[PDB]
Ligand binder design. Sequence first.
Ligand SMILES: [Ca+2]
Ligand SMILES: [Ca+2]
Ligand SMILES: [Ca+2]
Ligand SMILES: [Ca+2]
Ligand SMILES: [Mn+2]
Ligand SMILES: [Mn+2]
Ligand SMILES: [Mn+2]
Ligand SMILES: [Mn+2]
Lengths: 237, 237, 237, 237
Amino acid sequence: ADTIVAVELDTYPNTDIGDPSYPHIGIDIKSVRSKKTAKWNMQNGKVGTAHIIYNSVDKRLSAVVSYPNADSATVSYDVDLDNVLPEWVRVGLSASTGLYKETNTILSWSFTSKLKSNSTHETNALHFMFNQFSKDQKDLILQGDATTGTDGNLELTRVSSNGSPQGSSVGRALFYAPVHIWESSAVVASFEATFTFLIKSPDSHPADGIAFFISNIDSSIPSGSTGRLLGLFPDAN
Amino acid sequence: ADTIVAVELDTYPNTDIGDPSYPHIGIDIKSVRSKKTAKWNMQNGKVGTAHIIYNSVDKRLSAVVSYPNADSATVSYDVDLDNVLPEWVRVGLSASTGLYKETNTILSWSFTSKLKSNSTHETNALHFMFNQFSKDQKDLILQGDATTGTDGNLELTRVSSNGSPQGSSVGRALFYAPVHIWESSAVVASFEATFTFLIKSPDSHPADGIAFFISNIDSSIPSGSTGRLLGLFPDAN
Amino acid sequence: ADTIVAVELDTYPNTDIGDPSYPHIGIDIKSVRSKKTAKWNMQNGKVGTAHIIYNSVDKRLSAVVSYPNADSATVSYDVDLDNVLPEWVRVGLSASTGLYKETNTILSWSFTSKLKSNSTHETNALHFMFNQFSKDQKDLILQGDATTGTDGNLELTRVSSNGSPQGSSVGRALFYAPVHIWESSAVVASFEATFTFLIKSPDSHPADGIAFFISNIDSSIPSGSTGRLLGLFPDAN
Amino acid sequence: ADTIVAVELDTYPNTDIGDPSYPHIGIDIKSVRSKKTAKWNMQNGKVGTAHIIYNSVDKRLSAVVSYPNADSATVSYDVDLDNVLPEWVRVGLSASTGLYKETNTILSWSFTSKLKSNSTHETNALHFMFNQFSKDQKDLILQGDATTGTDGNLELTRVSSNGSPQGSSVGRALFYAPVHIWESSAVVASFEATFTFLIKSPDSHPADGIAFFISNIDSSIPSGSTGRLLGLFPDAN
Ligand SMILES: [Ca+2]
Ligand SMILES: [Ca+2]
Ligand SMILES: [Ca+2]
Ligand SMILES: [Ca+2]
Ligand SMILES: [Mn+2]
Ligand SMILES: [Mn+2]
Ligand SMILES: [Mn+2]
Ligand SMILES: [Mn+2]
């Protein structure tokens, strides 16, 4: 099985796998049963923004989510990612629906990783920024039901020709290049990610959510990971 | 009196003001008596690099210092800088000598500050990078004995025409623009700084050190702040 | 008198000073009588974006302006800016109204300048990005009628309490730090600027326009530079 | 056959394929017979830096090469790259030796590509920066004799265990992700690249050179492209 670290924007409360009884933001370390959660006042049909930050000095994975005109939600968890993830990873976005559903539309995604060595300075970095997505977006690896180019956006889960979200859908987008998150000479390693999203549903109960994740380079959607598993995990262990 | 937050590279142990009995890196919050220190294996005559990082989510000021071919030193301290510093600040480098002395030569200095609001994204930033310093470096405010342009470097303390460091010297360089570190709409604020330095002395006992600092916009060198006060503080309280 | 280089977004045709008979984008080198113009299909009440680029190898000042859903306009002019401007400059935005009027609202402004020397690499840079403007925006020098903070924007010219633009108005905003555009060791120097603007008028004939400019560090609004002079020039020579 | 655009640092004069009678920098558009050249005072055993710049407004490919303590060389050529290259490309470094030889050592490589659309702003970008290269550099596609990790560098051509360059060698390194250089909504597209290199030879006549190139995504070393063909072209047409 893959190795996954993720920040989830979890729209549906599954209380038997430890979700709180409300939409929430969570930090997931090798399990869908988040290590830490915070209440998230999710707004159906509004564009929101998520930010994720980490560095190897402090060893704290943190995230913040907001909408215009609204207060933010934040969550943090102390974890040494070099003890969880391999030295080379891929980074991605994932989303799912089940019997309950929503659009999982990404309007923008940026990421920056840096490795500073002890050689005079000495800086190594990767940065990408998407503010549109075209039909043939060659620097993304699309998995499952994910598509690019409809209204210039990344649709992680299936949307009907009329714009209605579909149930029982899972999809992911991974950046094409592998990312180097640990190196033996690094004195500080850091990453930051931001994405803007639009979660809409005809229903009072949207599901299931969107996640930013970091994985082994060869990660793939686990079998049966629709719905509450967010396209990330094979089971709810 | 000014308000100062600083990361010190303290080359001389002054044990009556709480220094450990060795060169050390420290976090200074409104006092020269560091809140946290770590041992620093300072190398006379070699070029080193310091990194300083902070964000308003985690509220942890951290620093790392290294040389080529050597292990690093690091220090961290939990502090909410919005409860210490004003909303607008200046950022700078400071150094001093006393009866013991050293060169306090800066070869490069970079800084990045970001304020992310809840408006769609919404990013505000300041970045500067110096890898040389000319004679008339109009975007630096020089204080005390600091000069620019000798061998293209920033000499924080006085150096004789022959290159020998002088005693009883203090000097600072502040970036010309004020820096916005808090704003009411910000959902995350962060800063990072890096500088490369060359501390050389003819003597077995160099003094006194170099600091990266953040201050009120109108900060000036306190009277009598040569030597152990690092050009930062009026007394050792 | 100041030394001015500017890219004008000129909303009102003043045919006796060489304007074409339509709104236009122009390159202004020490005169309001542009060296080069292109037709600009200005849209009253819509948010547009302008981009300005230059480097010292090619010695060509270029600009592009667009709106969403519309084609762009572009203009270029061959000019060695080191023969026009001093080594240190300030950069700014300017706008005016006369007997005809418009809002001259800036929603965002970014700028990047780089000087690459022959020392190993060796990079020097300044970057700033504003996506909001607060009431007390200490890193801007405001001149004339310019204000910050109304709806989070920079209003270059006066707007009544009800939002109606006023006539006979001029205002500018300059970045606080001086900018180094030439240095003796530089092997390549470049700059890029972007700003987003909203020009609205109740009238079929808006005036007078918005400009991005580069000037001597001590530049000030010339006497009598409302209307067709764009807050930039003392006369129409 | 591949489609190649390159900037060559050509160390050996092959006068029957149009080289000038001295080391030179050149712009190569689909042929090893440069469209434009300039004299290059190459220094055996010294670290140099090359810069390459282009944008779609001006349609001018320019390059500058220098050493510390020395004057620069520059070359430019007017060319619309959207009429030469496909919309998606890979970017790379190439080098070769023949019966004459040199080390073709890369110490650093950076690249930035940007696509600005007419949507509010709207920015898309890719940036990478290498200041070291490890043994298993997963974000580089190595071709031919290229290796990474010896002394932390990228060795494009073969070097014996003792550090002597070998003859009859060719090697390339391409960034792993495809790069988007044209898009239908872009109003400005640009790229910039920088690399630092060390060309050393025991011989009074080093050969053959180093190039930065842009190619179809599936580009490979052409058969027989050692020596004067620089790992780029199948023949000297
Ligand atoms: Ca759930
Ligand atoms: Ca001390
Ligand atoms: Ca006019
Ligand atoms: Ca040749
Ligand atoms: Mn959950
Ligand atoms: Mn101390
Ligand atoms: Mn005009
Ligand atoms: Mn040639």
